[PDB]
């Protein structure tokens, strides 16, 4: 029978290299009274904000807290501080890492158990040189990649239509093709654009207009066969209840840190499953600790059936603090095996692959 | 790192004594490939139904199943069989018992952790001789009982009003008083009745009319300050979404087996928390195994904040198959400590306290 | 630190020449206690009405009023007199002209600052001889005109369709083509007409039916991809809230004097921006003073993004009282530079270019 | 004719003393190419967040920007950065300070002109020792204080009722009494509480339940004569449109920095005026620069007719960087006179009254 309390934390502001460059990351190391270590990462969606949140506001809540009572601590952190979802999620992550390691269970195991072992990984089609992208697809489809997301509303509409025509002409339904307008359309004049791309039967169209325009989003969903997916229209459980009530979307992207962590993401998905709205894992931060957390969540959350994608594939994380990277192959992320988050971090791996501020 | 599969089951039809008499109960014993035993109980809300369900329909799904993948198995059982929520919940119960014992965790721990250690237990006020009941209250309030539920719509309305007047005159707000009409009112003529008892400010009024009359229930909630609690109007997540949409209740009773188990009850409560509807634990079956399951659920589910009550207090379970009983004292159930469900069952305890059919 | 009061006014009823002729215009000259002069113009949408309004009803409100407190004076004029929006707007115009000249600021500057320096100017296509119009377009598109508005519902529907076909055949999307039915359609039988012209993807269709038929207008908007623009359905902020609530239009034309002035037009557009409805500057009166006011407003009001047009291009204002005309070139009005309204009016310019009644 | 660009900024993180202690504040000094200085302050509702926002994200937008084009710059800052409303509002504040000083106009003048010269200031009644508070009221009412806000839902309901009875017994309608539950009620059981305090006819009841529960808030408003005021339910124009649509409140508190600045607050109030919802100035930060901004806004925004209050009166700002403090007397804030914000800050006043980090 395992019971133990948090004994100390270390908060690290680290710099990590990318190539498209630098990015800063907040990592939290929690250590129990019986010696077991767990890691969390606060990924924004300003790292100084998160960094201070943990160091001053949340520190006296973490310290002493019983590690088996994660939901209880999250309710304490939400009562004392308002809306630092990223920092709170790093604490939850780390406590679940510890609890998992102490009991021989993964985080997925502690969230109802795995329902899948791999997660479809979307490949972004966003190259100004479409021919460059076509050859990538030409190699990737035979290698088992099926999920592609085309950035749309960037080139003249006619050109984007010819591109979609070329893609459906070669691949037909062998690709699971999604479109993303990145909120760039206005409700005025969006419908002719959306109706044109709806003829190619994309699996979904992501958030064509900004967060406010729920009636416009409901209008699109009502007129179009193609599923409309809410991203910025749905951050949390409250937004989701309004999306359902207005029928403003057919699917939602789940943002572990926008919604406020792993348990909150599963609560969100209970609503969505009842309402018949599939979830998409959204943009996962490539930082190994936050990515491990997201992969475990999705592994244990059957309604998140639309796969996932990386924060911005066009700039890849070159060195990380994990002893071993979370792996992807043939169009899917491999859900790391092993207790807790299923990752390891040593002093050397940390202080030798990131510059500590 | 623990991983193991179900290796065998035994299904027992048992007779157990009561005093107001006999009742029949379906108990399931599951045993893993690494020797660890877990128990579940199917409590109706006909035991032959449940008994056959486990023995023929569900047996080939249980056998071989990985015990860490509880949600995955529940999705298999719902796909292959429709609407035997009781039998499926006994399987889940037992797998969580095993998983808990294998890892040193309670079932609450595996459901996000405890958020409470005791559960307020409602005392039913239903004696035709009210003076008998008044003396009971006279002793119980000083002993720490606060929660009382009066059965109403049984004696002439005037008499029930004089009773409520006597109760508020002595106790005021020192008692948390609830009323239950047991669906006995009709939508025609209910409002004058309900308005009269609303003046005594009960904590809630339970399901005054049958399940169908959601508009009537919404009508009551709209006219009355007193919270209306849905019982038979809300069995599952689907009912709850309609209750929210119609604003047909202010609170719901959660039926672990009506809704389809422990994880389904927590999904139900994610919807209810977002919607601002508190949960009540409803009528818990006194059979020790099902009661342990219900107590763990409520221990780990913060939105179920209205306490609980026993199936029918007027007939108490005289001997049970547990080595030690789940305990209540001073108006609350004590959430049993220890791994899994936190109960033990030996061959002797089973075959010497229940008659096996 | 500038502070000053209105010291006197002169109200002028003037006759001005046109060619298709005469029109009468109400001009107001306000003069501060520190000598600075400002002009306003009341443009109907009977000039005797406006003329008396200023001379008797509003005169005792203007006189003495602090010129820095424009919104305060407008609230006084709305409290004492009901619904002479034109005359009140001339007072506001003039006070902002004075305030601007006193401080070295334009009217746009006093309304949050310019967000644009030119305003797209719509060219009306309304010639019975379409070939005459086609040659005009043939010259104007290469000269930088993009915005065209076709009067529709005037020639037999078949002929209007062949015209639209010829226009899209030559110009494609190189023209921003709008259609205007001038309220001539009835809700009975409008939808087949509107669906036919919707295939040519006009940028918007203006007020196909009269003001009353908001459900009909909402019906059109719901069935058609093409934006429906409200004109006579939306005069003021109150109408706009109902248009939004009923989703009766996708865009609105803002009538500076119908809505009750420059500040009221910006309040109207705050609602419309939140609701995702772009504004169109509507029909601007060519009288230089009112036109300067409208151009400043639009310059400072980013949501009015659909351009503007002149009251009736088929009859042009031949001589005006401005020392220099507001200029348009290559399909856009040039927002006049300089303090206040950015226009000048001398005794000679006034008494030598208009006949004073 | 004045035109000029921003030439440089200085961002200061300062510590300021209070007494109930320390607080940190972000102050921004902007300087034009023609030498004129303006100040802004970012008041949270973590100062490191705001501090970095200005220094790295917003700095290249501010530098070079034309000071007459405030709305244009705000649209640039909202396009490049998402949701740092505090930091953006400090930039707007400072540019309006400069523009005002350059032209001899106050910020109110640039926002349509003053409509009032004083702002009713609410006095918080929150002392556990009510008798202490009663004597304060006894002195303050004869001195001209009329506006009082009682914190409610803190002492037992019965005691709060006796307090309200004593207050109405002495003062009757000579006090403008407001109640604030600080979101402490739950939708379950709130109505009996609210109905009890509604009998004392408070001017309004502020946000009795958390932000999510809009249907509950609409329920309260529908059942009660007393106005319900939205605070956390209404941050911005988008929330307000939903509040209006659901009729979830009768009045709103306007948060200059929650809504995203001074112009955004006036846009918000155009919606609210049309909808018949009065505004309340909410909790103003006592830091002199942010307070000057809030006072100018309210001075120029007639719909904010419910007065204002200070962030937390129980801890007063002991020394500030203003040469002279914004003044209050006899229950009202005096809107500071003079160009721009109407405040001055020297090197000595700044570096001698706050500790610079
Ligand atoms: Mg659809
Ligand atoms: Mg997105
Ligand atoms: Mg009610
Ligand atoms: Mg019941
Ligand atoms: Mg439409
Ligand atoms: Mg028109
Ligand atoms: Mg009301
Ligand atoms: Mg508040």
Coordinates of N, CA, C and O in Angstrom, one line a residue, chain C residues 112-117 299-300 302, chain D residues 61 65-79 95 263:
Chain C
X112 N -10.5 58.4 -33.1 CA -9.6 57.3 -32.8 C -8.5 57.2 -33.7 O -7.6 56.3 -33.6
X113 N -8.4 58.1 -34.7 CA -7.4 58.1 -35.7 C -7.7 57.4 -37.0 O -8.5 56.5 -37.0
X114 N -7.1 57.8 -38.1 CA -7.2 57.2 -39.4 C -6.7 55.7 -39.3 O -5.7 55.4 -38.6
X115 N -7.5 54.9 -40.0 CA -7.1 53.5 -40.3 C -6.9 53.3 -41.8 O -6.4 52.3 -42.2
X116 N -7.4 54.3 -42.6 CA -7.2 54.3 -44.0 C -7.1 55.7 -44.6 O -7.7 56.6 -43.9
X117 N -6.5 55.8 -45.7 CA -6.3 57.2 -46.4 C -7.1 57.4 -47.6 O -7.2 58.5 -48.1
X299 N -12.8 57.0 -42.7 CA -11.3 56.9 -42.6 C -10.9 56.4 -41.2 O -9.9 55.7 -41.0
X300 N -11.8 56.7 -40.2 CA -11.5 56.3 -38.8 C -12.3 55.1 -38.2 O -12.3 54.8 -37.0
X302 N -12.7 51.2 -39.0 CA -12.1 50.2 -39.8 C -13.1 49.1 -40.3 O -12.9 48.6 -41.4
Chain D
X61 N 6.5 47.1 -32.6 CA 5.3 47.7 -33.0 C 5.1 49.2 -32.6 O 4.7 50.0 -33.4
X65 N 5.7 54.0 -34.7 CA 4.2 54.1 -34.8 C 3.7 55.6 -34.8 O 4.2 56.4 -33.9
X66 N 2.8 55.9 -35.7 CA 2.2 57.3 -35.6 C 1.2 57.5 -34.5 O 0.3 56.8 -34.4
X67 N 1.5 58.5 -33.6 CA 0.8 58.6 -32.3 C -0.7 59.0 -32.5 O -1.5 58.7 -31.6
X68 N -1.0 59.7 -33.6 CA -2.4 60.0 -34.0 C -3.2 58.7 -34.4 O -4.4 58.8 -34.5
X69 N -2.5 57.6 -34.6 CA -3.2 56.4 -35.1 C -3.3 55.3 -34.0 O -2.8 54.2 -34.2
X70 N -3.9 55.6 -32.9 CA -4.0 54.7 -31.8 C -4.8 53.4 -32.1 O -4.3 52.3 -31.8
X71 N -5.9 53.5 -32.7 CA -6.8 52.4 -33.0 C -6.0 51.5 -34.0 O -6.2 50.2 -33.9
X72 N -5.3 52.1 -34.9 CA -4.5 51.3 -35.9 C -3.4 50.5 -35.2 O -3.2 49.3 -35.6
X73 N -2.7 51.1 -34.3 CA -1.7 50.4 -33.5 C -2.3 49.3 -32.7 O -1.7 48.2 -32.6
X74 N -3.4 49.5 -32.0 CA -4.1 48.5 -31.2 C -4.5 47.3 -32.0 O -4.4 46.1 -31.6
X75 N -4.9 47.5 -33.3 CA -5.2 46.4 -34.2 C -4.0 45.6 -34.6 O -4.0 44.4 -34.8
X76 N -2.8 46.4 -34.8 CA -1.5 45.7 -35.0 C -1.1 44.8 -33.8 O -0.7 43.7 -34.0
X77 N -1.2 45.4 -32.6 CA -0.8 44.6 -31.4 C -1.7 43.4 -31.2 O -1.2 42.3 -30.8
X78 N -3.0 43.5 -31.5 CA -3.9 42.3 -31.4 C -3.7 41.2 -32.4 O -3.9 40.1 -32.2
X79 N -3.2 41.6 -33.6 CA -2.9 40.7 -34.7 C -1.6 39.9 -34.4 O -1.5 38.7 -34.8
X95 N 0.0 56.7 -25.4 CA -0.1 57.4 -26.7 C -1.2 58.5 -26.6 O -1.0 59.5 -27.2
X263 N -10.6 52.5 -25.7 CA -11.4 52.4 -26.9 C -12.3 51.2 -26.9 O -13.5 51.2 -27.2

